[PDB]
């Protein structure tokens, strides 16, 4: 139809387009490279090529497709690895024996010949169905059922529904008639990558994430369907938090879309997650590959593919939320994505903005993030599902003045700001508790109240202790601990105990691999109770000394309780809640025995 005129980098200007709408995917050259339109100037239209452009001719034919960037949905989408343009990577590696990814490969996103079992949900002939109604369920794999729903833009009366049995995506499982005309439906569902899936109404989240790590789940919580941002740090961050959110989280499934990251790290993730025998069910050890999905696009991948990867990832989140699961999507991208925007904007000769980033960066980041949030689904039955966006930010080497960082913090609700100083000190969870925040602390009031009606007060006391210690650290840096009084000394002792016991976690051992909420809240209550009792004791002033003398008395003649407090982190979760709860209650009773026995003889 149309022919190439100009080829500069990944930007191709093809004349003769005429009626070629924006973002209407076109296919370029004899090799048939995918490609999306980015600008128009008349009979010619700019194209992004999503692939290497070396070898393009002049007057090399370009074919239009009239369809915007679309990802193919349906069964088998779970547990696969897709390129940014949604090509099945394993399918390419097997179908073609070559270990490389050939230029311009045309493989269907989902296999069209695998036999899938069909279980209709009691839909009768002549019945009325509507957009997103859940007419059949397919067990894509054990422990993860896949409901099949009509597309949001579909309705009609059920003239024919296929019976239960083995079906393939090429078959018509359902028929509808509407407005005097009939339409057919298969198990596939193509959807534009942008234009988020429709929602009956959004909702305000109440359930917390309750992730494995103690700091995240206790100090700076996140809600299901929430929105987070970590500064994409390594050793910590992109590895430990990713593992916690994948294999040790209450989200019903995972969608890892980390693009623009190192190839070795991607290979390590893609080789470690295959085993990954997380106990997601109550008593089953099913591998999480039956639960997750990768949209990996390495750094060497074409620059124009980053946005496609991000949007396909968030679109896949939407399909699952629509079925009902509480998906949680983690994006190691959005640090390379800003670079991708800079590259395309500069090549498209757009006028730059503050710090050289395109002026519309905030708009794109908003249009991405605001697709989160738990949502009341379409169709029948009534249902609910959520999508969580735990994205990535520039590593802690640049201040928050970074335009990507400022744009994220202008939208993101929970900031797990990792600090590089903690990473130097080898504190592995590495969350800086002074700069992090969670605006969800108010909505979680009901859950905290019902779980433990006194957790809010102990959390506030812990925050006050940490802030007081960080405040007088500067004073100590000038004068020293010589002038520190009893209250200051006990506050610093409790802060050090909290820092090394509570806020740390190894995550490479059963002690800290996954800390349940009850164990974390019990540690917090124990530490805060010790702090309060010690402060009351040093305020009593009995024995004519009290004060720091009583502090030394409780640190020497009562230090076994202190050692048990600092070793409480090692309570093995495998022992079960009825055992660990009893152990912590006994430790609390022993602590209450102290500061009363210590007050018996008036110090």
């Amino acid at each position: 139809y149309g022919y190439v005129r100009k080829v500069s980098g990944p930007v191709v200007i093809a004349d003769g387009m005429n009626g070629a709408a924006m973002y209407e995917l076109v296919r370029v050259g004899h090799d048939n490279l995918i490609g999306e339109i980015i600008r128009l100037e008349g009979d010619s239209a700019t194209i992004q090529v999503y692939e290497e452009t070396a070898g393009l001719m002049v007057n090399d034919p370009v074919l239009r497709t009239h369809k915007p960037l679309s990802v193919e949905l349906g069964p088998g989408i779970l547990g696969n690895i897709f390129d940014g343009i949604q090509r099945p990577l394993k399918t390419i590696a097997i179908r073609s024996g070559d270990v490389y990814i050939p230029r311009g490969v045309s493989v269907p996103a989902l296999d069209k010949d695998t036999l899938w079992e069909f279980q209709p949900k009691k839909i009768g002939e002549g019945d009325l169905l509507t957009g997103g109604d859940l007419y059949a369920t397919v067990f894509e794999n054990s422990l993860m059922q896949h409901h099949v729903a009509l597309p949001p833009d579909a309705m009609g009366k059920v003239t024919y529904v296929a019976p239960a049995g083995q079906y393939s995506l090429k078959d018509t499982v359902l028929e509808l008639e509407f407005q005097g005309v009939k339409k057919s439906f298969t198990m596939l569902q193509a959807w534009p990558v942008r234009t988020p899936r429709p929602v009956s109404s959004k909702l305000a989240a109440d359930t917390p994430l309750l992730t494995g790590q103690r700091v995240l789940d206790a100090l700076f919580p996140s809600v299901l369907g929430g929105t987070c941002a970590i500064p994409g740090a390594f050793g910590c961050g992109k590895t430990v938090i990713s593992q916690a959110l994948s294999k040790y989280s209450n989200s019903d499934t995972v969608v890892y879309v980390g693009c623009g990251e190192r190839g070795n790290e991607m290979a390590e993730v893609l080789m470690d997650f295959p085993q990954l025998t997380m106990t997601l069910p109550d008593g089953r050890e099913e591998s999480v590959m039956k639960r997750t999905t990768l949209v990996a696009n390495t750094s060497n991948m074409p620059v124009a593919a980053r946005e496609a990867s991000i949007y396909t990832g968030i679109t896949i989140a939407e399909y699952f939320r629509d079925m009902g699961y509480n998906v949680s999507m983690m994006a190691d991208s959005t640090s390379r994505w800003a670079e991708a925007l800079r590259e395309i904007s500069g090549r498209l000769a757009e006028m730059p903005a503050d710090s050289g980033y395109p002026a519309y960066l905030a708009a794109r980041l908003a249009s991405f993030y605001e697709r989160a949030g738990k949502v009341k689904c379409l169709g029948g039955p009534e249902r609910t599902g959520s999508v969580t966006i735990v994205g990535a930010v520039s590593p802690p080497g640049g201040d928050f003045s970074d335009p990507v960082t400022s744009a994220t913090l202008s939208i993101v609700q929970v900031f797990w700001g990792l600090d590089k100083k903690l990473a130097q000190r080898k504190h592995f969870p590495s969350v800086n508790w002074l700069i992090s925040y969670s605006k969800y602390s108010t909505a979680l009031e009901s859950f905290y109240e019902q779980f433990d009606p006194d957790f809010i007060n102990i959390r506030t006391k812990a925050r006050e202790v940490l802030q007081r210690e960080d405040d007088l650290n500067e004073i100590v840096q000038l004068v020293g601990k010589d002038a520190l009084a009893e209250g200051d000394k006990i506050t610093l002792e409790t802060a050090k105990l909290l820092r090394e016991d509570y806020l740390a976690q190894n995550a490479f051992t059963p002690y800290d691999k996954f800390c349940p909420f009850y164990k974390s809240v019990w540690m917090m209550r124990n530490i805060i109770h010790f702090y309060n009792l010690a402060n009351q004791a040093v305020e009593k002033g009995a024995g004519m000394d009290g004060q720091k003398i009583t502090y030394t008395l409780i640190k020497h003649r009562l230090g076994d309780l202190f050692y048990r407090l600092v070793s409480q982190k090692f309570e093995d979760p495998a022992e079960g809640e009825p055992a660990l709860v009893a152990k912590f209650k006994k430790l609390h009773e022993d602590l209450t025995a102290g500061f009363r026995a210590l007050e018996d003889e008036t110090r």
Binding site: I81, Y100, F234, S299
Partner: protein
């Protein structure tokens, strides 16, 4: 395949600005088509087509643009991308920037032509760096180790001995598994690519490789500073293509030393400026990240083949910083960062490697009970913490006085002194066995009492705190 067509030859050189000749009235112009330019004098240069637009086409020239005239300068479109010839004979030879042999020998007889920027590897076919290579340098071996298929860029500044430590690594690199490892395939078949190097550095590397007896193994692609600037943007790609052919299609472990990546960022800047493109940070091209990804992500073990590619691209910060766009992007992409600090050099320690800024993402995979002592991770994580806390203590004592320090403060200061002197320093020709390095690290650690060793677990303490 059926019949060929002899390449067209033009003369319509309507514009020559800097390293770019702007052809005109051309037909069928490929993108990245390699062109041959025959000047009026008869000398032949070789160029590349950076951009095609209508009948026009913009051609950069590698060997410079010092003689082109609008009348006589003939340009010929080979109608293909760059293809460096490759063969097993490419081992043990030294080459120019663009691949022309400079060893006074004959040109390569090719086994095949492999297009530069080789075919992308499907991530579903890569494997994480499994085995560890012994770097000889103790600081690298104990913290920030290197596994086969890793991308460790050495961050340095002008004047620091980054070239010397690179040569030491080249001479000392070897396997570690149970200390057991002819090994001709185990021989790392180093491919050295130098861009923008002072002739003294090139002579140094040449002499070191010749003396170490590796002259039958190593391979050198040189782009000296006096050599044309543009060839610096092709030399590392040629080196990586040669490494890929020597490793994946020939089953040899391969090690690559890219030198002065800042001298490659400079070429990117020159090319981008010559095209009047939109600049990025500090005027660097907006797509420098894409180019650096393309030049780094071509290393790593592959599942279907026994080969491997492990590259150590050394880097020179302009004003000894990290916020500069090139080291920043390299840190973003590469899986490691070895830091050579001016402070250590001012204190006269031959390896100035600052162990605190250092980092290796794949460190947790190379180490392990199957190939290392079980305490390796503990030992590293404790030395790092004590060094960092001791540095804080020294900073505090710099203002509060040596008298105001406590006993723990004095212990930390003594640990810092013996760590920076006895541990970090190593001979310019003497290696250290990984177990010997761990023994030295344990001697350093045992200064502190058992109570202060918070990171080390008691199980490893019982087997090692006494020895």
């Amino acid at each position: 395949e059926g019949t060929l067509e002899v390449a067209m030859e033009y003369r319509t050189v309507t514009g020559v600005a800097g390293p770019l000749v702007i052809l005109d009235k051309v037909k069928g112009p490929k993108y990245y088509e390699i062109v041959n330019i025959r000047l009026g004098d008869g000398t032949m240069r070789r160029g590349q087509v950076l951009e095609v637009d209508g009948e026009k086409a913009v051609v950069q020239v590698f060997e410079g643009t010092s003689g082109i005239d609008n009348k006589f300068t003939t340009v010929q479109f080979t109608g293909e991308v760059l293809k460096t010839p490759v063969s097993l004979d490419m081992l043990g030879r030294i080459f120019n920037g663009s691949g022309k042999p400079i060893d006074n020998g004959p040109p390569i007889l090719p086994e095949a032509y492999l297009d530069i920027s080789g075919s992308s590897i499907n991530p579903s076919e890569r494997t994480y760096p499994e085995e560890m290579i012994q770097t000889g340098i103790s600081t690298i071996d104990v913290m920030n180790s290197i596994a086969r298929g890793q991308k460790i860029p050495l961050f340095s500044a002008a004047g620091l001995p980054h070239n010397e430590i690179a040569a030491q690594i080249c001479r000392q690199a070897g396997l570690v598994k149970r200390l057991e490892k002819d090994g001709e395939e185990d021989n790392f078949a180093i491919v050295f690519a130098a861009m923008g190097v002072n002739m003294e550095t090139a002579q140094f590397f040449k002499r070191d490789f010749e003396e170490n007896g590796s002259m039958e193994r190593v391979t050198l692609f040189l782009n000296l500073a006096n050599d044309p600037t543009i060839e610096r943007i092709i030399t590392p790609r040629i080196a990586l293509t040669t490494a890929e052919y020597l490793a994946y299609e020939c089953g040899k472990h391969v090690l690559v030393i890219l030198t002065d990546m800042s001298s490659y960022a400079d070429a990117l800047r020159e090319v981008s400026a010559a095209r009047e493109e939109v600049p990025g940070r500090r005027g660097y091209p907006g797509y420098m990240y894409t180019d650096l990804a393309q030049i780094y992500e071509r290393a790593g073990r592959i599942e279907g083949r026994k080969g491997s590619i492990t590259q150590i691209p050394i880097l020179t910060m302009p004003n000894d910083d990290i916020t500069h766009p090139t080291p920043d992007l390299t840190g973003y992409i590469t899986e490691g960062q070895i830091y050579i600090d001016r402070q250590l050099q001012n204190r006269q320690i031959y390896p100035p490697i600052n162990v605190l800024p250092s980092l290796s993402r794949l460190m947790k995979s190379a180490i392990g009970e199957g190939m290392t002592r079980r305490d390796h991770s503990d030992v590293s994580n404790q030395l790092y913490a004590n060094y960092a806390i001791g540095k804080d203590v020294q900073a505090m004592k710099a203002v509060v006085g040596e008298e105001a320090l406590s006993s723990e403060d004095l212990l930390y200061l003594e640990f810092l002194d013996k760590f920076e002197r006895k541990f970090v320093a190593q001979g310019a020709y003497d290696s250290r066995n990984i177990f010997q390095s761990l023994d030295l690290a344990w001697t350093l650690l045992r200064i502190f009492p058992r109570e202060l060793l918070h990171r080390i677990p008691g199980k490893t303490l019982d087997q090692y705190y006494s020895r």
